[PDB]
Automatic annotation (TrEMBL), chains A, D, E:
Disulfide bonds: 144-148
Gene coding for it: HA
Signal peptide (residue range): none
Name assigned to this protein: Hemagglutinin HA2 chain
TrEMBL record, chain C:
Full-sequence range covered: 18 to 125 of 565
Residue positions with a glycan: 11, 23, 54, 87
Domain of life: Viruses
Protein name: Hemagglutinin HA1 chain
Species assigned in the record: Influenza A virus (A/New Caledonia/20/1999(H1N1))
Disulfide bonds: 55-67
Length: 171, 53, 108, 171, 171
C-alpha cells in the first residue's frame, strides 16, 4: 500500500494473534503475548463489510431473459438481438472485473493506513519514554508492567509519571 | 433431467443455488439469477495481506 | 520491556488481483462469482416445469398424436424443450407466426 | 478518512469559523479568535468543484427517446425494445450510485489530508519552540504576539529568533 | 497529490537525474551528483505498467459490427438499432473518460507517496546525525564521505558510529 506498514515498517504479520486484525504484542517481567485492538479491528471490519455489501446489494437481480427464436428471414433481427446481448455482456464484464481490481487495491491501502495509525497512536503516547526500533516496536526506557501495557494500549498512558526513570535510563 | 429439487434460478445446464451478484454458468436464465459475466473469477479481499513474520 | 504493533497473518492461500499487482495472497476474501449448478431441472418456488419431451411447441399445441402425455398438463413454471424435437407438424406445412406464438405461450 | 484528522487528532470542527474550510484558532495576550487559511481552502474548493463538474459535464444530455408502439404480433420486438431499455437503466443506475459512493469516500479523505497537512506545516515551522498537545494545538514556549501568529500562519516563522526564550521556558 | 511531496516539501524535480524516477542528490568533499533509487523506481514502474495494461487488456476487441439496412416501412426497427448503438456509445464514452481521469489522479498520488516514503526512510536512518532543511534535504552534522552516502541510500547507515562527532558539531 501507500502508507508503508504492511511488510514495511512491520516485517510481517503475526500468526500468533487470533482475536482480530490489528493489535499489539508485548513483553515485560510479568509475561508476554499477543492481543488484538478490538476497536481498530471492529471499525475496519464494519467499513469493509459495508463496502462488500454495497457492491453486491446495489446490483439488481437478473430477471428472466431468454433468447428469442427468429425465422430464416429475420436474420437482421436475430443479429440485433445478439448485438444487444453481447454489448451488455461486454459492459458488465469490463465493469465487474475492473471494479473488483480497483476496490481490492483500495482495501489493502485501507488496512495499511489502519495499522500505521495504530503505530502513531502509541508513538504519541510514549514520546520520550521509549525509542523506536525496527519491526514497528517501541522499546521502553522504564519498567512497564501489565497495568502500564494496558494503559498504553488504551491511550491513557501517564507520560510524565515515568519521565524521571526514563531520563536516568537513557544516560 | 428433472428431479425432486427446487431453486430460485434455473439455467439450461442445471439449477443455481446461490446469493452472489454474478455467475459465469450461462447467459440464458429463468428465475431470480446472478448476472452473467465472462469473468473467470471475481474475488474481493476483505482481510489483510497474508505475509507472516 | 517492549510494546509492538502489528497485524494478523494465517495459513490462507486466497489470492486476489489488484491494479498494481497480479497475485496477492490475503487472509480473508469473498467470492463474488458463482460458477456451479446442480445439473438438474428443478421446480421454481414449488412449481414444476412443463416437459415437452420429444415434442416441439407446435407439436404440443396442435395435438400431435405422439404428444398425448402433454394433454393433462394444465399448469407450469417454465417450458422445457429437447434440443431437437422430433414430434411437430406431423402433416407438413407452414406454421404461421410460430416464433411469435412461442413468445406468447411462454408467458402462460 | 485514512489520514486521521477529522474527529481524530482534531476533536471536531469549529462552528465559530465562518470564512473558509480549513484554518486556525489562536490565543495570546492581544486577543483570540478564528481565521481561515484562504490558500488551503481555495485550493480544496477548486479541486472539489472540478470533480463535481466533471461528473456532471461528462454526462451527455438525454435526447428525445420515447417508447414505441407494437402490434399484437410484434411481441418479440416489443420485448427486445424493453430489454434494451431495462439494460441501459440497470447499467446507468448501478454506475451512478456506485460512482457517487466511491467519490464521496475520496472527498472525505481529500479533506482529511488537507487539514492534516496544514497541521504538519505548522509543526515544521515551530520545531522546538512549541509543544504538541491534543486537539491539533501547539502550545508555545515563548510569547507569540499577533505579528508572530501571522508569521506562523504564513509559513515565515523565524525559528531561531525565539529559541533562547523557549529554552529557558522549557526548563 | 495528498501526501504533499511533489512541488511540496520538494521544490521541484531534477532535470539532472536521468536514470530513474525517484532518487538522491548528494554533495560531500569527494564530489557531487544525482543517482536514482533503482529499487523504488522499478517498483513504481511495475505497478504503473500493470495498471495501464489492466485498463487496455481487460477490454475486448471490437468485433465486426456494421449498421443494417432497413426499408421505408421499418423505421421503428431502424430507430431501435440506432438507439442500441447510441446507448452503447454513451456508456463507453462516459466510462472511458471518467476512468482515465480517476486513474490519472491516483497515479499522481502513488508517485507523491513513493517519494515521500523515500524521504522518511532516510529521516529514520539519520535520526540526530542530520537536520531537516527545506527542499527535502538532510544536512549532516558529521563528515559523510562517498561510502557513507552509499550506506544511507542502501538503508545500512550505522547511526551510533557518527554520534560523537555530530554531538560536538551540533553545539
Ligand atoms: C489452517 O490451520 C487450521 C488448523 O489450525 C486448519 O483447520 C485450516 O484448514 C488451515 N487452513 C489452510 C488454508 O491451510
Ligand atoms: C497468477 O496466478 C495464476 C494461477 O492462479 C497464474 O496462472 C498466473 O500466471 C499468475 N500471474 C502473474 C501475472 O503474476
Ligand atoms: C424420445 O426419443 C428417444 C430416443 O430415440 C426414444 O427412446 C423415446 O422413446 C422417445 N420418446 C417418447 C416420449 O416416447
Amino acid at each position: 500500500g501507500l502508507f508503508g506498514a504492511i511488510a514495511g515498517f512491520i516485517e510481517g504479520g503475526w500468526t500468533g494473534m487470533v482475536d482480530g486484525w490489528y493489535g499489539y504484542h508485548h513483553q515485560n517481567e510479568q509475561g508476554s503475548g499477543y492481543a488484538a485492538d478490538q476497536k481498530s479491528t471492529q471499525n475496519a471490519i464494519n467499513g469493509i463489510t459495508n463496502k462488500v455489501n454495497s457492491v453486491i446489494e446495489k446490483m439488481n437481480t437478473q430477471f428472466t431473459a431468454v433468447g428469442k427464436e427468429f425465422n430464416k428471414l429475420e436474420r437482421r433481427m436475430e443479429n440485433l438481438n445478439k448485438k444487444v446481448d453481447d454489448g451488455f455482456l461486454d459492459i458488465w464484464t469490463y465493469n465487474a472485473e475492473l471494479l473488483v481490481l480497483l476496490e481490492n487495491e483500495r482495501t489493502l491501502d485501507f488496512h495499511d493506513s489502519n495499522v500505521k495509525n495504530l503505530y502513531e497512536k502509541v508513538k504519541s503516547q510514549l514520546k520520550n519514554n521509549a525509542k523506536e526500533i525496527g519491526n514497528g516496536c517501541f522499546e521502553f526506557y522504564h519498567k512497564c508492567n501489565n497495568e502500564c501495557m494496558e494503559s498504553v494500549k488504551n491511550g491513557t498512558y501517564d507520560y510524565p509519571k515515568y519521565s524521571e526513570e526514563s531520563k536516568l535510563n537513557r544516560e | 433431467p428433472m428431479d425432486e429439487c427446487d431453486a430460485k434460478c434455473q439455467t439450461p445446464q442445471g439449477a443455481i443455488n446461490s446469493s452472489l451478484p454474478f455467475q459465469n454458468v450461462h447467459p440464458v436464465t429463468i428465475g431470480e439469477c446472478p448476472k452473467y459475466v465472462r469473468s473467470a473469477k471475481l474475488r474481493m479481499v476483505t482481510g489483510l495481506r497474508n505475509i507472516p513474520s | 520491556d517492549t510494546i509492538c504493533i502489528g497485524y494478523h497473518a494465517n495459513n490462507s492461500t486466497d489470492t486476489v488481483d489488484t491494479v498494481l499487482e497480479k497475485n496477492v495472497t490475503v487472509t480473508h476474501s469473498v467470492n463474488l462469482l458463482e460458477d456451479s449448478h446442480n445439473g438438474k431441472l428443478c421446480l421454481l418456488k414449488g412449481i414444476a416445469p412443463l416437459q415437452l419431451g420429444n415434442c416441439s411447441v407446435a407439436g404440443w399445441i396442435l395435438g400431435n398424436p405422439e404428444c398425448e402425455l402433454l394433454i393433462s398438463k394444465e399448469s407450469w413454471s417454465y417450458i422445457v424443450e429437447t434440443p431437437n424435437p422430433e414430434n411437430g407438424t406431423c402433416y407438413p406445412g407452414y406454421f404461421a407466426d410460430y416464433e411469435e406464438l412461442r413468445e406468447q405461450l411462454s408467458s402462460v
